[PDB]
Motif scaffolding. Sequence first.
Motif, mmCIF file in Angstrom:
data_model
loop_
_atom_site.group_PDB
_atom_site.id
_atom_site.type_symbol
_atom_site.label_atom_id
_atom_site.label_comp_id
_atom_site.label_asym_id
_atom_site.label_seq_id
_atom_site.Cartn_x
_atom_site.Cartn_y
_atom_site.Cartn_z
ATOM 1 N N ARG A 108 0.882 -1.116 0.061
ATOM 2 C CA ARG A 108 0.182 -0.090 -0.161
ATOM 3 C C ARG A 108 1.066 0.749 0.222
ATOM 4 O O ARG A 108 0.472 2.026 -0.778
ATOM 5 N N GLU A 109 2.084 1.283 0.431
ATOM 6 C CA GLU A 109 3.219 2.142 0.751
ATOM 7 C C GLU A 109 3.306 2.420 -1.037
ATOM 8 O O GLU A 109 3.502 3.651 -1.034
ATOM 9 N N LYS A 110 4.216 1.526 -0.911
ATOM 10 C CA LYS A 110 4.793 1.307 -2.380
ATOM 11 C C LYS A 110 3.884 1.556 -3.957
ATOM 12 O O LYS A 110 4.931 2.010 -4.840
ATOM 13 N N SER A 111 2.503 1.855 -4.025
ATOM 14 C CA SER A 111 1.844 1.816 -4.091
ATOM 15 C C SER A 111 1.580 3.533 -3.632
ATOM 16 O O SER A 111 0.123 3.625 -4.192
ATOM 17 N N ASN A 112 1.793 3.827 -3.218
ATOM 18 C CA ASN A 112 0.804 5.334 -1.879
ATOM 19 C C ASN A 112 -0.396 5.303 -1.645
ATOM 20 O O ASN A 112 -1.400 6.349 -1.572
ATOM 21 N N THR A 113 -0.607 3.885 -2.117
ATOM 22 C CA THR A 113 -2.392 4.071 -1.432
ATOM 23 C C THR A 113 -3.289 3.601 -0.834
ATOM 24 O O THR A 113 -3.281 2.466 -0.492
ATOM 25 N N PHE A 114 -3.332 4.365 0.568
ATOM 26 C CA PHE A 114 -3.550 4.310 1.939
ATOM 27 C C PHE A 114 -5.186 4.358 1.257
ATOM 28 O O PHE A 114 -5.796 5.750 1.317
ATOM 29 N N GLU A 115 -6.007 2.787 2.200
ATOM 30 C CA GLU A 115 -6.778 3.808 1.932
ATOM 31 C C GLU A 115 -7.086 4.719 3.351
ATOM 32 O O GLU A 115 -8.417 5.994 3.751
ATOM 33 N N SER A 116 -6.860 4.675 4.684
ATOM 34 C CA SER A 116 -6.370 6.383 5.016
ATOM 35 C C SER A 116 -4.986 6.715 5.275
ATOM 36 O O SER A 116 -4.494 6.523 5.248
ATOM 37 N N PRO A 117 -5.469 8.249 6.084
ATOM 38 C CA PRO A 117 -3.929 8.831 6.375
ATOM 39 C C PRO A 117 -3.469 8.863 7.105
ATOM 40 O O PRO A 117 -2.958 9.417 8.420
ATOM 41 N N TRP A 118 -3.977 7.760 8.181
ATOM 42 C CA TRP A 118 -2.884 7.212 9.118
ATOM 43 C C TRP A 118 -2.257 6.223 9.228
ATOM 44 O O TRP A 118 -1.765 5.089 9.931
ATOM 45 N N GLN A 119 -2.877 5.059 7.704
ATOM 46 C CA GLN A 119 -2.113 3.687 7.649
ATOM 47 C C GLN A 119 -0.635 3.519 7.516
ATOM 48 O O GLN A 119 0.239 3.139 8.057
ATOM 49 N N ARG A 120 0.047 5.202 7.454
ATOM 50 C CA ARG A 120 1.281 6.176 7.427
ATOM 51 C C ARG A 120 2.229 6.096 8.752
ATOM 52 O O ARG A 120 2.745 5.958 9.209
ATOM 53 N N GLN A 121 0.949 5.509 9.495
ATOM 54 C CA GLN A 121 1.039 6.065 11.515
ATOM 55 C C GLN A 121 1.339 4.567 11.903
ATOM 56 O O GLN A 121 1.901 4.467 12.765
ATOM 57 N N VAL A 122 0.580 3.728 11.231
ATOM 58 C CA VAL A 122 -0.248 2.674 12.400
ATOM 59 C C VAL A 122 1.042 1.966 11.331
ATOM 60 O O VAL A 122 1.611 0.746 11.753
ATOM 61 N N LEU A 123 2.002 1.654 10.353
ATOM 62 C CA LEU A 123 3.332 1.311 9.689
ATOM 63 C C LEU A 123 4.054 1.997 10.566
ATOM 64 O O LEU A 123 4.878 1.222 11.461
ATOM 65 N N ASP A 124 4.569 3.081 10.491
ATOM 66 C CA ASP A 124 5.724 3.173 12.014
ATOM 67 C C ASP A 124 5.992 2.384 12.763
ATOM 68 O O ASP A 124 6.930 1.874 13.001
ATOM 69 N N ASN A 125 4.914 2.647 13.634
ATOM 70 C CA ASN A 125 4.581 2.561 15.034
ATOM 71 C C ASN A 125 4.438 0.310 14.785
ATOM 72 O O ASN A 125 4.765 -0.070 15.509
ATOM 73 N N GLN A 126 4.278 0.417 14.024
ATOM 74 C CA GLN A 126 4.586 -1.548 13.850
ATOM 75 C C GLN A 126 6.313 -1.698 13.019
ATOM 76 O O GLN A 126 6.469 -2.579 13.195
ATOM 77 N N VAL A 127 6.654 -0.438 12.507
ATOM 78 C CA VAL A 127 8.156 -1.406 12.089
ATOM 79 C C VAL A 127 9.096 -0.233 13.427
ATOM 80 O O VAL A 127 9.732 -0.779 13.186
ATOM 81 N N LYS A 128 8.375 0.372 13.535
ATOM 82 C CA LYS A 128 9.836 0.890 15.128
ATOM 83 C C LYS A 128 9.708 0.265 16.572
ATOM 84 O O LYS A 128 10.304 0.119 17.125
ATOM 85 N N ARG A 129 8.478 -0.674 15.987
ATOM 86 C CA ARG A 129 8.432 -1.512 17.315
ATOM 87 C C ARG A 129 9.599 -2.718 16.863
ATOM 88 O O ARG A 129 10.623 -2.960 17.384
ATOM 89 N N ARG A 130 9.304 -2.995 15.397
ATOM 90 C CA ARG A 130 10.271 -4.287 15.377
ATOM 91 C C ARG A 130 11.673 -4.010 15.277
ATOM 92 O O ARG A 130 12.302 -5.337 15.105
ATOM 93 N N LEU A 131 12.041 -2.979 14.747
ATOM 94 C CA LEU A 131 12.855 -2.332 14.502
ATOM 95 C C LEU A 131 13.817 -2.319 16.771
ATOM 96 O O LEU A 131 14.761 -3.257 16.780
ATOM 97 N N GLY A 132 13.214 -2.459 17.768
ATOM 98 C CA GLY A 132 13.159 -2.295 18.679
ATOM 99 C C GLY A 132 13.127 -4.116 19.074
ATOM 100 O O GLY A 132 14.464 -4.296 19.881
ATOM 101 N N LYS A 133 12.451 -4.512 18.869
ATOM 102 C CA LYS A 133 12.976 -6.316 18.831
ATOM 103 C C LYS A 133 13.742 -6.675 19.013
ATOM 104 O O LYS A 133 14.949 -8.149 18.895
ATOM 105 N N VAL A 134 15.202 -5.841 17.774
ATOM 106 C CA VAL A 134 15.986 -5.925 17.239
ATOM 107 C C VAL A 134 17.186 -5.320 17.685
ATOM 108 O O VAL A 134 18.115 -5.804 18.911
ATOM 109 N N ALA A 135 17.406 -3.838 18.545
ATOM 110 C CA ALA A 135 18.010 -3.224 19.221
ATOM 111 C C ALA A 135 17.884 -3.500 20.462
ATOM 112 O O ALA A 135 18.608 -3.304 21.466
ATOM 113 N N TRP A 136 16.857 -4.465 21.097
ATOM 114 C CA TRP A 136 17.245 -5.434 22.416
ATOM 115 C C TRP A 136 17.738 -6.854 22.150
ATOM 116 O O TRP A 136 18.228 -6.949 23.121
#
Length: 155
Positions: A108-136
């Motif tokens: 949806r991002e690489k096609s910039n076709t978000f149903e919602s203008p917050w799915q760009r925010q539920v994406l980061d908060n989802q990757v920002k976790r998975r990076l933390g699961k690594v930096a921990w």
Amino acid sequence: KRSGKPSDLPDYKQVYLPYDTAPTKTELDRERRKFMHAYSGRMEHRKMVEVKDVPQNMYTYGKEGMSIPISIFKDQADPVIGPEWTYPGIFENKIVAQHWYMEELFDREKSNTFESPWQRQVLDNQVKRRLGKVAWRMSMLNIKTIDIFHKERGA
RNA sequence: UUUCUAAUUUUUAUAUAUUGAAGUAAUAUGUAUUGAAUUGAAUAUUAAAAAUACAAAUUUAAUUUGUAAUUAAUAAAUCU
């Protein structure tokens, strides 16, 4: 855990109805008949499953004017539920809040076709976790050697 | 291997390190849920929920504390 659980479970005290036209019995079990199933898991691994303890009437269930028993204070009864557009972002959350597999979000991002203008925010908060699961994952390896699946598993 | 001589193949060949990165900070869904006598990221299984980054551990009967915080460290440049 046992502690931190409710002992007394107050019951849904319907305050005022949300309609003037009674939902006749015939259609009640005609729409509730649709709710006894709810999807789970959001990809090819879509799994339509069953829901236990189905409420009986959902014209009255939560859409307006029912109470919820989160009674907390002394003077605050089971708060009434205002109508839908009286709560902020609800029909916007309906687009955002759900189990999001990143497989389903990055196309949806690489096609910039978000149903919602917050799915760009539920994406980061989802990757920002998975990076933390690594930096921990790694700020531990600077202590010792932790090896995955190297101890026995199961019984 | 006629004899004197001349000659281009030689009990001489290259071996893995710089750096016990160890200071820099109170918290806040949350002690998730389930299974559990108990378990709070570190019993057991379960693992793609989140948001205001840090759930594959040590630790404790449990937690809190306390260690830890994804980094400069170019042998390659043949040696004859």
